[PDB]
Amino acid sequence: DTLLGRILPQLVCRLVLRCSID
């Protein structure tokens, strides 16, 4: 989840998944 989920793809992790209560 780092270097590819905490910098660029994180967008689709803390902004998208977070929105849909993941």
Residue 8 has phi, psi (to 5 degrees) of -105, -55
The Cα angle at residue 16 between residues 14 and 19, in degrees rounded to 5: 85
Q: What share of the chain is helix, strand, coil (3-state, %, to 5)?
A: 25, 0, 75
CB-based contact 10:22 (threshold 8 Å): no
One-letter amino acid of 19: C
* Rounded (10°) CA dihedral 4, 10, 11, 15: 160
Tokens 């992790």, residue?
13
Amino acid at 7: I
Query: Are the CB atoms for 5 and 13 separated by under 8 Å?
Result: yes
- CB distance 3 to 15 below 8 Å: no
- Give the determination technique: NMR
| Cα–Cα distance, 16 to 14 (Å, whole number) | 6
Q: Which residue has the tokens 């905490």?
A: 6
